[model samples]
Target: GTVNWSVEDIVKGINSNNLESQLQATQAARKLLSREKQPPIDNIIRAGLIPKFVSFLGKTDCSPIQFESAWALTNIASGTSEQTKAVVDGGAIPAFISLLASPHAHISEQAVWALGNIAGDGSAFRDLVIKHGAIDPLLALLAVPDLSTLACGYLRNLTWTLSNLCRNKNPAPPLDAVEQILPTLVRLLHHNDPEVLADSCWAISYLTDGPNERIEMVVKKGVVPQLVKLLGATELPIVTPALRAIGNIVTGTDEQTQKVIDAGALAVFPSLLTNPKTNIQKEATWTMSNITAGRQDQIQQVVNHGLVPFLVGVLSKADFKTQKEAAWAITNYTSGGTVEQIVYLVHCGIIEPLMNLLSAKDTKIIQVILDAISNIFQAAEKLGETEKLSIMIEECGGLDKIEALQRHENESVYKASLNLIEKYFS
Candidate 1:
């Protein structure tokens, strides 16, 4: 099938001195790339017309054309797997790489955009681009003044590419790659632009998904303190990312958990537990969960900061995601606390809402609620509060169902309940 518009005509329209025509042509091409039938557009990209169009890069009179062309190429490169292969096979990589150095700002911006889309394919092109020093140019763009809005989207794509690359089926990148990007990403946390800060925070968090040492490296780069500060900001455009970063940093690392406590994150988090925005409250709850999972001292700090009441409030009013997270956090917090904290939680009627969660359609929520009940029961037994133990058992449905839980199928819930029942009898 032939395209009604010739490649030369499209290129001419793209490079034409008329700005409106350039915009219109780019729009048309963008629309064409999204169609279910993309053969004509795919053919144009495959036949090496991209290199011809890219030749307009440095021409002063054709800046808009160059910009629009870069934008078009971005959509084309990302349109489909077949189109992406065509772009790479037709030598768009080098031309796209060359635009990274263009004098015109939009040209460079568009080039970064296109590269990000191409990199997202996670194919040979990802390595080809990254191996050619893509990280440095991306970091440089991140530091460029007033370019953060544009850089935010591009960096998001670039980091996503690096993440996939490091996890490639083939051999992963060396530790040097991790060393190269992590520090710069940590520094970008202080960027005045919220989106840039958010993306950088998310990138660094994803990169450090492994063990205690990785969490330590991120903290050594000074991320914990800055993230805690971001948590307190009223403009929380970046808060969810910051919370996720904190959660990963402290997930299973004892020392990093202390760092979170020392940075005052544990104290600041409970206040946000009942935050109206669902994602914000969810991240805050998860962060607290991670913090309390390891650090015993952080429990009182969290409880003293009114975590139980706030969590109960969230349980009563939050969406299902927030409810599940609050339940999990409360479970973890009580898992390491004294009997008094458990009694306080019980006296506050926390078990009522928790038991109500057993009827939730979401299985995860039901499991969290059950686990929390078991943890509360164990704490009561540990302190020898037999009467409180029976009260909790009654509130959580009763010993009959508690005993029946031993045979429940979901291993997490059954095991947790079994552990609680064993503590109760002991």
Candidate 2:
């Protein structure tokens, strides 16, 4: 059966009406593109096999042949940019995307794996995939009802491809142009797989991390409610990126922060503050900074959620990074807070712990500590109500602590320490 193959014989075998010819051609292409020995990429392209191989995906009759075609495509994608571009220019995206919904898992698997590489080649290649419409189908993989029932790692490639596409820049349209995926992604926040949960949360993080309009789009799709619920997930992978996403949401307009608060994001603060992970605790305080930075009504909303006790708890015990957030948080609430908000803080006992902070020797934090404390005075001035705060300071020997900061090196500290002594002692 030894026969010398001519170039036209190979092309006829691949494109011929004869099934045997096509299968033989596919076999040669797969080996040619296989790991061990690669012929020149242009060899396959010139053989006129790329388009014929791509067309084989719809051949429903040949699963092995289709896998070979996808495998060959994947290998070529791994070649130089020009090699991958040959596939892109040959019109591979539509064929590949159609195969994603295939009945055979391995067929679909290679499609996802190949597109990931093709898309990974460069933005132009990815732009071709997106321009032909991959977002809905890509996210549809995550929306399947049998998600938990499927083989473990089946969805990993889908999510990985998603993350790779998201990593594509020049988003003239924005993050995977993603939105309907919001609720689906939020639903996966509770998925059993850490990999699923991690990637799902990351997708949400990137979607919300876009421009203001896109952030609002996430909110409108009801991201705030699910994000609040996920803030309590135990696994670091699950909770970490969820926290990062929530942090981004709060950074938007005051109305956006209110939407998160209205979803009861503040209710999770107590549990978040007690978390051993300093990063989550810092993220919670970052959320608090935005919540308290809003209007008088918004500040009161956080106050009503019982934020002060945990707020001060972080200041007293969490790491220096956490303490910085704690101070930043209180300063926002204090400076932006109304008279009643300031008094509510004192009545809730911010004085004792705050006085204790003044005794700390970390001159680095002195500025924040003073700025955070000064707002209590700044807020009281809003009501011409200074007596109760002045008396509260004297009772805790706040004046004695203030006297030393006057001699500190930082000029901001000099002003705060002297101003405090002048305001209360004068």
Candidate 3:
């Protein structure tokens, strides 16, 4: 059928004044977009179907025409930026932006569908969509419930578009609707749609990625609890972005970090650590690494949940990047974590890995390990276990590694080594 799809005829059909002609042209456009003719969709895009499709989206009285138009443009937006640029240049965005405000959920949903594809192409195109006033209407669509839970979930596509838009660079065009749309994103977290759940987490990640004030706003809206719950998802797609978003939030003030823990994030980390998927372990424990930067109780919050055992395991058994992340988490443990938490790590088998890491030769690795041992020896001193822990360090040939580093070049590592010796064996 695509062999006979006449670009000239189709463009002529869309350029007609009769409604029947326009509908058939759009139907043909949709049909023609489907087949495998090399550069076929490319030719159709070049024929300028987008402005015509955008024209049909304005048929407020006819839902079918609007849907068809959106569907066609959505397919078009899925093409290369050079192809999608035809729609952008044809002024389809402002049209799509207007349709997103329609009381018709299907129309709004399809507009979101198209715009999301547009945003995905590139940052410049993405900001153009936002600049043309997509955010406000998109936020409004989410504020009210979905127009219908009918097939394919209208809101799911819309929510995902919002998420992609958030991925744009900082400010991403004054996402003022954030205050209004935030709770909607939180609500979407539990939505059964995998894409929606992933999108919501990604949106949360982007929103918190910039501007201290926006991060504060999103935190106050109460996403942490739900975000934490998502880690338990057996699905990696769901888990990755959720962990990413939580990672961003924990980087906030102590209040923000505690919010994630209070929501049972600490409880979830151990199970997530063993997920077998490197990405999951990488993200989940990376979140833990940040969690340790908190006050004593915050650090203890993780320990209280038995995370030290898993983190210790990562240092010894996980990949190099993850081991380093787990090591950084341990550094937080020893640095801010209480004595009970610190000593629990030693028994959890942190000593050998921690000592072994002293020879890593990288400044970052050395710095955290030195910091961790400082916390360990101090905790050991408090527990009358300093010599016990020190002996283990000696058995591993760690004492020589630690002492040789006393005059190391990195100022921070050298100071940490001095502090370790003075505070413990000195």
Global fold similarity of model 3 (TM-score): 0.82
Model 1 lDDT per residue over 108-226, tens place? 77777777767667646667767766777666655655445654555555444444434332333345666777766665667676666666666666655666666666678777888
Q: Candidate 1 at residue 67, lDDT? A: 72
Q: Rate the local accuracy (lDDT) of all candidates.
A: 0.67, 0.76, 0.78
Off by over 4 Å in 3: 1-26, 35-41, 59-68, 101-108, 121-127, 135-152, 172-175, 190-195, 358-363, 374-389, 399-426
In angstroms, the error of model 3 at 68 is 4.2
- Choose the strongest candidate by lDDT: 3
Instruction: Kindly report which residue stretches of model 1 are placed more than 4 angstroms away from their true locations once superposed.
Output: 1-43, 46-48, 54-68, 123-125, 140-174, 361-374, 395-426
Instruction: Give the worst 10-residue stretch by lDDT in candidate 3.
Output: 143-152
TM-score to native of every candidate shown: 0.75, 0.69, 0.82
In terms of lDDT, model 2 sits at: 0.76
User: Considering TM-score, which of the candidate structures 1 and 3 is the better prediction for this target?
Assistant: 3
Best by TM-score: 3
Task: Report how far residue 337 has shifted in candidate 1, in Å.
Answer: 2.7
Q: What is the lDDT of residue 304 in candidate 3?
A: 73
Tens digits of lDDT, candidate 2, 122-223: 667766777877877777776667678766677777766775565444662344455544566556655677787777777678767766787887788776
Candidate 1 deviation (Cα RMSD): 5.6
User: How many backbone clashes can be found in candidate 1?
Assistant: 0
